[PDB]
Structure 1
Amino acid sequence: SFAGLKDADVAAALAACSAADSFKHKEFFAKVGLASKSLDDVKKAFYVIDQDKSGFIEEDELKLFLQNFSPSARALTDAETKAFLADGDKDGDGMIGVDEFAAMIKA
């Protein structure tokens, strides 16, 4: 709700990635609805995911990604995490800042 996402798209998207090692971020952002929202909402989701308010999505926070969507969601695998961080962290600091995050969703 935090990023104006609908219950039904979140339900459907978790359905597909229910299973270990099956998460694909790009497919998820599309299905959950995030790829078609405004930049502003893309930013509020960003700041939701950054649980510690550091201004960056640290790797440990990227691992509990799904949990922001649903409390009973699984943590991502290290393989899933690495893959996500590979795509998102273009400045090579090992963290995802707001601008990288936003940019990665623009696909």
Structure 2
Amino acid sequence: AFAGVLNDADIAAALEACKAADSFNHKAFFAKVGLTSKSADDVKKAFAIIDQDKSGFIEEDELKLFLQNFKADARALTDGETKTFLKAGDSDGDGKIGVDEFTALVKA
């Protein structure tokens, strides 16, 4: 879903680096794919794609499928990767990530 608004090669390389189970690092991913340098406005767009059901939050089931928003055949994160990613982004502890949280996960 980003393929048009993130570069093709950046995505591929991002995915290749975390093909092994439990090798995912969201900072590593974000930097490589090129989202860290994006505008808060484009980051919000990115957010909406990940939030598959448009609930206004990225729930754990959506975080598990994070990579698949980038390349449809990407692997699911393991439970440990998902919990780690959740824990880093979920500032208020509601077990989900809201747009402001997402923005801080991407940029900081």
Q: Note whether the superposition's TM-score is higher than 0.5.
A: yes
TM-score (norm 2): 0.95
Structure 2 partner of 1:96: 97
Deviations 1:10-38 (A, max 9, x none): 01100100111100001100000000111
TM-score normalized with structure 1 length? 0.96
Runs of 5+ unmatched residues, structure 2: none
* Number of aligned residue pairs: 107
Q: Is the 8 A contact 1:3 1:42 kept in 2?
A: no
Aligned sequence identity (%): 76
Shift of 1:2: 6.3
Structure 1: which 5+ runs fail to align? Answer: none
Amino acid at match of 1:97: G
1:91 Cα deviation (Å)? 0.4
Structure 1 residue runs of 4 or more that deviate by more than 4 Å after TM superposition? none
1:52 aligned partner: 53
Q: Which residue of 1 aligns with 2:12?
A: 11
How far is the alpha carbon of 1:3 from its aligned partner?
7.5
CA distance in 2, matches of 1:63, 1:103: 19
